[PDB]
Amino acid sequence: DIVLTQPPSVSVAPGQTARISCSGDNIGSYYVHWYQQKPGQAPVLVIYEDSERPSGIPERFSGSNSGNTATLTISGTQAEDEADYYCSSYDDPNFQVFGGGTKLTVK
Amino acid sequence: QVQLKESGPGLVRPSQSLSLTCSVTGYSITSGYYWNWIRQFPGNKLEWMGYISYDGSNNYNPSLKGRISITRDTSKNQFFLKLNSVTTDDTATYYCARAYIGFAYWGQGTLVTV
Amino acid sequence: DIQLTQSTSSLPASLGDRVTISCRAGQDISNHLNWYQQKPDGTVKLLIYYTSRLHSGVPSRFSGSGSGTDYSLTISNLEQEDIATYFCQQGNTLPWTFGGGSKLEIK
Amino acid sequence: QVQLQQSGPGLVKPSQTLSLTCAISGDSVSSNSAAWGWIRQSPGRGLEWLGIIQKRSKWYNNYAVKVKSKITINPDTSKNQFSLQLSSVTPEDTAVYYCARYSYPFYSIDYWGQGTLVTVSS
Amino acid sequence: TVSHEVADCSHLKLTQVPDDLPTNITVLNLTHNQLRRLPAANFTRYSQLTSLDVGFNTISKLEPELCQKLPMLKVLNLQHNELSQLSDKTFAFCTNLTELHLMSNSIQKIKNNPFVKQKNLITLDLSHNGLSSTKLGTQVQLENLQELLLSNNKIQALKSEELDIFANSSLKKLELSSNQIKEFSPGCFHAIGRLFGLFLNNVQLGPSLTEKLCLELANTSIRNLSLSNSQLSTTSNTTFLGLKWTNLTMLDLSYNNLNVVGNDSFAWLPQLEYFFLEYNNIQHLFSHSLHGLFNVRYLNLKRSFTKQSISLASLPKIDDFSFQWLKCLEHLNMEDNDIPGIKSNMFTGLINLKYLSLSNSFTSLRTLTNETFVSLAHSPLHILNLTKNKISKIESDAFSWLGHLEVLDLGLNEIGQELTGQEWRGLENIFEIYLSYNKYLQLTRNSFALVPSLQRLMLRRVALKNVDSSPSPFQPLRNLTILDLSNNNIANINDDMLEGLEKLEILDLQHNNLARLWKHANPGGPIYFLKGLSHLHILNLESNGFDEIPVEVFKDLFELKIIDLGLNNLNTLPASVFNNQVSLKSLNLQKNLITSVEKKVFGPAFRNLTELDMRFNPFDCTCESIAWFVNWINETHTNIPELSSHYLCNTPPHYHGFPVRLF
Ligand SMILES: CC(=O)N[C@@H]1[C@@H](O)[C@H](O)[C@@H](CO)O[C@H]1O
Ligand SMILES: CC(=O)N[C@@H]1[C@@H](O)[C@H](O)[C@@H](CO)O[C@H]1O
Ligand SMILES: CC(=O)N[C@@H]1[C@@H](O)[C@H](O)[C@@H](CO)O[C@H]1O
Ligand SMILES: CC(=O)N[C@@H]1[C@@H](O)[C@H](O)[C@@H](CO)O[C@H]1O
Ligand SMILES: CC(=O)N[C@@H]1[C@@H](O)[C@H](O)[C@@H](CO)O[C@H]1O
Ligand SMILES: CC(=O)N[C@@H]1[C@@H](O)[C@H](O)[C@@H](CO)O[C@H]1O
Ligand SMILES: CC(=O)N[C@@H]1[C@@H](O)[C@H](O)[C@@H](CO)O[C@H]1O
Ligand SMILES: CC(=O)N[C@@H]1[C@@H](O)[C@H](O)[C@@H](CO)O[C@H]1O
Ligand SMILES: CC(=O)N[C@@H]1[C@@H](O)[C@H](O)[C@@H](CO)O[C@H]1O
Ligand SMILES: CC(=O)N[C@@H]1[C@@H](O)[C@H](O)[C@@H](CO)O[C@H]1O
Ligand SMILES: CC(=O)N[C@@H]1[C@@H](O)[C@H](O)[C@@H](CO)O[C@H]1O
Ligand SMILES: CC(=O)N[C@@H]1[C@@H](O)[C@H](O)[C@@H](CO)O[C@H]1O
Ligand SMILES: CC(=O)N[C@@H]1[C@@H](O)[C@H](O)[C@@H](CO)O[C@H]1O
Ligand SMILES: CC(=O)N[C@@H]1[C@@H](O)[C@H](O)[C@@H](CO)O[C@H]1O
Ligand SMILES: CC(=O)N[C@@H]1[C@@H](O)[C@H](O)[C@@H](CO)O[C@H]1O
């Protein structure tokens, strides 16, 4: 199977760079997506097929996928970027697999 | 110096039943007080499950109706937990504790994952 | 079934200072409140019972007050050990319910 | 632009049936390039997957195990909306429900529903 | 290690991708090596690759970047490797691919969507893998795919839930052979956007299961259906019923032990054009067995019928008119059978038949008569093959019905008779007659007077007799161009045998005894039987015992390109005997008693020669005898095969193994 697992929390000083990791046995063999969920809001796709963003998501957001870890990177952190972040992929029975979510905090 | 220690399964498959045993040393479970079962949800929330008095006549928590069992074995000085239909929200660190005015002596804790 | 909200003073404290952990209930619990010190090590102790009464061996920095729906726990001055989490709990009415807890952190 | 709009009873009694509706605009339900499904989130942060529908020659629906016996998702082309239903709901089913557009190739969810809180309490 | 715009590094014990090769290569063969992974870095310099064949290695998985490094890669061949786990990233960046070869990799199952990215792919081959299902994706992909190859797998059902991922694809080839299918669940073939060709060979199916498949094939664009070695014991009017609602134009039912063909079995195929029924055990071809096949223009019945067991009429049986419905049949092959004989209406109704091959089709056709081929009178037959049928006598007007026949092969038969020339009556447009390899053929002057249009006449090994008539039996054949009279021990040829045959181009006279007719001491003079043969290009006179050549036998053959007189006793030849051979390009005196290649003889011949062969000769290593030849050898461009090993000097005693080219 496949079990995405990401850190519980991470904080970032505004203006600095945030990275949120998503580990998993051979996650490099999968395409990963990233969903941003602010308090009391549906999530928002920010990175899909693990590398490049959708239309309207800012360039500050970027992701990679290598080996057994996949990371969402947020340069130039703003106050609005404070949210929960989930990584995802799909394996055949379950068409969406989610990580634990990481709660990103900003001063 | 009257402490108590839990023990039992660390893993239980869902929609099944959980059981735990708490031994008590130093003081017979039939002399006095009340003998409780307190759990701690993952987010550090706490919840008393029920007790078993010195005499046997016990009381259970409303939020666990018809699916919670607290018995005892005075011959070897312990009391047991039995949780029916163990779903996923029943994963917690399970403490055993003794109380007259409040829970005065707790157990070292044991984690149960479901 | 009975309401226990916890609220403290200044969030990170300086060592050797007064800290108050307040506790607000739903209805008059006739001063049947208790206070528990759980170090992240997992160990749980009773510190205060029936509002103000302290257990034995509990140092006299610890003192609880309040009468009715509002309570509190106070440390006359903080110390390294006193660095842990505290849950207010009542007994007046079944079922015996707890409060959210409060993490006591320094530095 | 495409956007998903939920609607339905947010209070449902135990042993009863939860029934919600995702109404699409800016995109067809019978369209290609995407599938439709539901994602549930219990208030303790758990953001979990429910099931999807999708069409190739006919409509297929792959549900998550754990609701594989209660859930029913199916489309309604005449109204351009799809539905969620759960039978014999327990208080465990109290959560926030999102309808979702997974898009091909690899089932990324470009667009979500507003979320509808459903509570299973007597 | 080899290159001409194409880097061949095959079979080099390589454990490492060569960094030696030039960076402008477009094909890279790395097959049959010990490679275990293809790290994308090692392919950075080879960016011009359009074909990458790396079959027969120990490769376990592909990193995605490998594809990114070759952005022109159109053909990837990973066959016969250990590549058994496919992820969504194994081919994700190999977009310009049109052929993906994944045969023999112990691929047991396919997970999600390995191929969803290959939008240009035309051919996908997943044969010889343990695939238990045709599931290749969870969505509709591969709309450009034309060839899906899944043969030789453990696939046992065809379900629309798995093939409908091709609902936008037009499959010219769907190869599902050597798979053990047991069910064709409904809709499975309409799942595919268009299905043109289906291949189910070596698929153990059976008559009732086969019936279902055709019902499932109903209303599909199917055009080619191949059920070879399907264990089709019998057929019925019900079997190919669903094929009624198709435009199927090709059907293979060969190698099926097909025992009984019920009537109207193929009534449902009015658009069929190619029928392959070879290699069956059909017992009895009833009247209506082939009813309905009125558009078929090619049938093949080679070894189609049962073989004579112990002869108690264990022979096959073809009722008359059995072919009357094939109106468009242009080409019929029935060779290698045990049909007892041609009945009076066997071939009736074949109004378009041009080619009919009947080689060894019969137990024996002992006698061809004016009744035999009567059923062909209304066909435009151009080619008729009657070889290997033990034919023994041909009688007058036997082929009179075959008016427009142009080629007739009666070779390899037991024909022993006198050719009166009545036989060929009716053959008005005949061009070739093959009579080689028969028992005995006795000629008259009219043996071919009824066929002047004849251009090829083959008389190899018939113990020919009476070729030495006053006007030769061949005199009426004034447009003969190829004549084969070999292996007849012909001892007497008359001067004027080939007179009139001004157009004769090939003349084979090898293995005869016409040796004395060119000795000087012949009673009356040597026989110049080659005179007037201007257009002769090939002349073969091997193994005739010749040991003299008259000075002017070849005096008229100016277009002679190949002269062939070896395995004779020629030692010395008259000077200027080859003078007029100006177009001569191949001279052959391979096994003879020649000792002296003098310039006065071989000069004009050697002038311009494409190839020379006079091996195994008792060459004399003396200047008077061999010298000028040795110079010409070292000089000339005409190639001399086996020169250094089979041109050996025999005299004088001191030069015996010396290859003639060394002195
Ligand atoms: C399997 C293989 O080819 N390995 C070699 C590796 O040993 C070498 O260090 C590297 C440097 O280019 O090139 C790789 O191709
Ligand atoms: C197609 C092409 O450019 N081929 C060249 C060739 O002309 C040249 O002679 C050789 C170096 O000797 O290098 C090859 O790459
Ligand atoms: C879009 C793209 O990359 N197309 C490539 C092209 O760059 C290359 O010149 C050609 C030759 O192989 O192959 C095409 O498939
Ligand atoms: C500039 C140039 O050489 N162009 C050619 C042309 O045939 C096409 O643009 C493409 C082929 O795919 O690349 C080259 O072969
Ligand atoms: C037995 C059966 O199913 N027959 C139907 C036929 O009535 C229909 O005309 C055709 C296409 O519409 O498809 C066939 O399969
Ligand atoms: C309903 C119908 O017409 N069925 C015919 C039957 O009449 C005929 O006798 C048989 C072959 O003998 O072939 C069936 O297709
Ligand atoms: C069974 C089948 O394919 N029928 C088609 C028919 O629907 C179409 O109108 C016609 C025009 O060419 O061609 C036929 O072959
Ligand atoms: C349009 C079509 O089907 N073409 C081929 C044809 O080239 C070949 O001669 C025939 C054999 O009968 O096989 C068909 O698959
Ligand atoms: C015209 C014709 O063919 N008639 C015969 C019929 O008399 C005979 O009873 C039957 C044997 O099954 O076979 C038929 O072929
Ligand atoms: C042995 C036998 O019964 N053969 C019959 C034949 O008599 C009949 O004429 C023909 C249909 O024309 O069908 C065959 O199966
Ligand atoms: C059956 C038979 O005799 N065949 C021979 C064989 O040399 C060759 O395979 C064939 C070409 O089809 O031509 C014939 O001379
Ligand atoms: C038998 C018949 O009805 N017609 C003729 C017959 O008169 C003639 O004798 C025979 C050749 O000998 O050729 C047959 O076609
Ligand atoms: C002239 C001609 O076609 N000769 C062929 C011969 O090559 C072949 O060996 C034999 C069996 O296939 O059939 C004959 O028809
Ligand atoms: C009764 C009979 O058979 N008459 C035929 C006759 O029609 C034919 O003209 C003649 C010449 O071959 O052969 C005879 O056998
Ligand atoms: C009787 C006969 O068939 N004569 C033809 C003649 O019509 C043709 O002009 C020539 C070649 O051009 O070949 C001859 O054999």
PDB file of N, CA, C and O in Angstrom, chain A residues 38-64:
ATOM      1  N   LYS A  38      -7.128  26.691   5.606  1.00  0.00           N
ATOM      2  CA  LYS A  38      -7.160  27.692   6.655  1.00  0.00           C
ATOM      3  C   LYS A  38      -8.334  27.410   7.577  1.00  0.00           C
ATOM      4  O   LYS A  38      -9.272  26.699   7.196  1.00  0.00           O
ATOM      5  N   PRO A  39      -8.306  27.938   8.800  1.00  0.00           N
ATOM      6  CA  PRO A  39      -9.341  27.582   9.781  1.00  0.00           C
ATOM      7  C   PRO A  39     -10.744  27.857   9.265  1.00  0.00           C
ATOM      8  O   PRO A  39     -11.063  28.966   8.837  1.00  0.00           O
ATOM      9  N   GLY A  40     -11.584  26.827   9.330  1.00  0.00           N
ATOM     10  CA  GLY A  40     -12.970  26.930   8.937  1.00  0.00           C
ATOM     11  C   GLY A  40     -13.141  27.230   7.471  1.00  0.00           C
ATOM     12  O   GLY A  40     -13.906  28.128   7.119  1.00  0.00           O
ATOM     13  N   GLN A  41     -12.403  26.514   6.620  1.00  0.00           N
ATOM     14  CA  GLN A  41     -12.446  26.697   5.178  1.00  0.00           C
ATOM     15  C   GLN A  41     -12.134  25.385   4.474  1.00  0.00           C
ATOM     16  O   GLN A  41     -11.305  24.597   4.939  1.00  0.00           O
ATOM     17  N   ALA A  42     -12.786  25.175   3.330  1.00  0.00           N
ATOM     18  CA  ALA A  42     -12.426  24.068   2.462  1.00  0.00           C
ATOM     19  C   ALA A  42     -10.968  24.214   2.060  1.00  0.00           C
ATOM     20  O   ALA A  42     -10.437  25.327   2.031  1.00  0.00           O
ATOM     21  N   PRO A  43     -10.292  23.118   1.765  1.00  0.00           N
ATOM     22  CA  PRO A  43      -8.891  23.213   1.341  1.00  0.00           C
ATOM     23  C   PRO A  43      -8.744  23.875  -0.028  1.00  0.00           C
ATOM     24  O   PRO A  43      -9.709  24.160  -0.746  1.00  0.00           O
ATOM     25  N   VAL A  44      -7.493  24.178  -0.365  1.00  0.00           N
ATOM     26  CA  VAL A  44      -7.157  24.767  -1.657  1.00  0.00           C
ATOM     27  C   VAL A  44      -5.930  24.068  -2.228  1.00  0.00           C
ATOM     28  O   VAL A  44      -4.907  23.944  -1.548  1.00  0.00           O
ATOM     29  N   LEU A  45      -6.051  23.572  -3.458  1.00  0.00           N
ATOM     30  CA  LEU A  45      -4.914  22.975  -4.145  1.00  0.00           C
ATOM     31  C   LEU A  45      -3.847  24.021  -4.414  1.00  0.00           C
ATOM     32  O   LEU A  45      -4.116  25.025  -5.084  1.00  0.00           O
ATOM     33  N   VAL A  46      -2.631  23.776  -3.914  1.00  0.00           N
ATOM     34  CA  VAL A  46      -1.513  24.697  -4.102  1.00  0.00           C
ATOM     35  C   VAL A  46      -0.381  24.091  -4.921  1.00  0.00           C
ATOM     36  O   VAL A  46       0.324  24.816  -5.628  1.00  0.00           O
ATOM     37  N   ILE A  47      -0.203  22.771  -4.858  1.00  0.00           N
ATOM     38  CA  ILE A  47       0.758  22.074  -5.717  1.00  0.00           C
ATOM     39  C   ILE A  47       0.163  20.731  -6.138  1.00  0.00           C
ATOM     40  O   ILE A  47      -0.325  19.971  -5.297  1.00  0.00           O
ATOM     41  N   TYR A  48       0.218  20.429  -7.429  1.00  0.00           N
ATOM     42  CA  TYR A  48      -0.258  19.158  -7.959  1.00  0.00           C
ATOM     43  C   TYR A  48       0.796  18.533  -8.851  1.00  0.00           C
ATOM     44  O   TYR A  48       1.711  19.201  -9.310  1.00  0.00           O
ATOM     45  N   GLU A  49       0.710  17.214  -9.009  1.00  0.00           N
ATOM     46  CA  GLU A  49       1.693  16.337  -9.650  1.00  0.00           C
ATOM     47  C   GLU A  49       3.095  16.576  -9.054  1.00  0.00           C
ATOM     48  O   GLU A  49       4.111  16.408  -9.748  1.00  0.00           O
ATOM     49  N   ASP A  50       3.150  17.099  -7.828  1.00  0.00           N
ATOM     50  CA  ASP A  50       4.200  17.377  -6.842  1.00  0.00           C
ATOM     51  C   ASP A  50       5.144  18.517  -7.204  1.00  0.00           C
ATOM     52  O   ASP A  50       5.898  18.954  -6.323  1.00  0.00           O
ATOM     53  N   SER A  51       5.048  19.120  -8.381  1.00  0.00           N
ATOM     54  CA  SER A  51       6.120  20.035  -8.755  1.00  0.00           C
ATOM     55  C   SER A  51       5.653  21.451  -9.033  1.00  0.00           C
ATOM     56  O   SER A  51       6.200  22.382  -8.427  1.00  0.00           O
ATOM     57  N   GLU A  52       4.634  21.658  -9.874  1.00  0.00           N
ATOM     58  CA  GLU A  52       4.253  23.015 -10.248  1.00  0.00           C
ATOM     59  C   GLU A  52       2.811  23.336  -9.869  1.00  0.00           C
ATOM     60  O   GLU A  52       1.957  22.457  -9.757  1.00  0.00           O
ATOM     61  N   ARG A  53       2.554  24.619  -9.682  1.00  0.00           N
ATOM     62  CA  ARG A  53       1.302  25.034  -9.092  1.00  0.00           C
ATOM     63  C   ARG A  53       0.201  25.188 -10.107  1.00  0.00           C
ATOM     64  O   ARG A  53       0.437  25.156 -11.313  1.00  0.00           O
ATOM     65  N   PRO A  54      -1.010  25.382  -9.603  1.00  0.00           N
ATOM     66  CA  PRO A  54      -2.142  25.673 -10.465  1.00  0.00           C
ATOM     67  C   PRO A  54      -2.172  27.134 -10.809  1.00  0.00           C
ATOM     68  O   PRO A  54      -1.294  27.900 -10.395  1.00  0.00           O
ATOM     69  N   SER A  55      -3.216  27.532 -11.523  1.00  0.00           N
ATOM     70  CA  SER A  55      -3.366  28.914 -11.947  1.00  0.00           C
ATOM     71  C   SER A  55      -3.848  29.732 -10.759  1.00  0.00           C
ATOM     72  O   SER A  55      -4.776  29.315 -10.055  1.00  0.00           O
ATOM     73  N   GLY A  56      -3.193  30.866 -10.504  1.00  0.00           N
ATOM     74  CA  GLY A  56      -3.557  31.744  -9.429  1.00  0.00           C
ATOM     75  C   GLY A  56      -2.846  31.478  -8.114  1.00  0.00           C
ATOM     76  O   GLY A  56      -2.806  32.371  -7.261  1.00  0.00           O
ATOM     77  N   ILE A  57      -2.262  30.302  -7.928  1.00  0.00           N
ATOM     78  CA  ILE A  57      -1.426  30.096  -6.735  1.00  0.00           C
ATOM     79  C   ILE A  57      -0.117  30.850  -6.913  1.00  0.00           C
ATOM     80  O   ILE A  57       0.490  30.772  -7.996  1.00  0.00           O
ATOM     81  N   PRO A  58       0.343  31.601  -5.918  1.00  0.00           N
ATOM     82  CA  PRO A  58       1.552  32.399  -6.097  1.00  0.00           C
ATOM     83  C   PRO A  58       2.789  31.537  -6.290  1.00  0.00           C
ATOM     84  O   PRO A  58       2.841  30.357  -5.913  1.00  0.00           O
ATOM     85  N   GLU A  59       3.813  32.184  -6.869  1.00  0.00           N
ATOM     86  CA  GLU A  59       5.095  31.546  -7.132  1.00  0.00           C
ATOM     87  C   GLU A  59       5.875  31.231  -5.861  1.00  0.00           C
ATOM     88  O   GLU A  59       6.832  30.450  -5.926  1.00  0.00           O
ATOM     89  N   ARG A  60       5.518  31.843  -4.721  1.00  0.00           N
ATOM     90  CA  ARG A  60       6.208  31.541  -3.467  1.00  0.00           C
ATOM     91  C   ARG A  60       6.146  30.056  -3.129  1.00  0.00           C
ATOM     92  O   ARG A  60       7.088  29.513  -2.538  1.00  0.00           O
ATOM     93  N   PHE A  61       5.084  29.382  -3.566  1.00  0.00           N
ATOM     94  CA  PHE A  61       4.845  27.976  -3.294  1.00  0.00           C
ATOM     95  C   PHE A  61       5.502  27.102  -4.348  1.00  0.00           C
ATOM     96  O   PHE A  61       5.396  27.371  -5.551  1.00  0.00           O
ATOM     97  N   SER A  62       6.113  26.008  -3.894  1.00  0.00           N
ATOM     98  CA  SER A  62       6.847  25.103  -4.771  1.00  0.00           C
ATOM     99  C   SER A  62       7.084  23.805  -4.029  1.00  0.00           C
ATOM    100  O   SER A  62       7.213  23.792  -2.802  1.00  0.00           O
ATOM    101  N   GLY A  63       7.177  22.718  -4.790  1.00  0.00           N
ATOM    102  CA  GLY A  63       7.337  21.404  -4.208  1.00  0.00           C
ATOM    103  C   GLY A  63       8.327  20.561  -4.981  1.00  0.00           C
ATOM    104  O   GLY A  63       8.689  20.875  -6.118  1.00  0.00           O
ATOM    105  N   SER A  64       8.785  19.493  -4.325  1.00  0.00           N
ATOM    106  CA  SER A  64       9.636  18.486  -4.946  1.00  0.00           C
ATOM    107  C   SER A  64       9.242  17.102  -4.428  1.00  0.00           C
ATOM    108  O   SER A  64       8.353  16.961  -3.577  1.00  0.00           O
TER     109      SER A  64
END
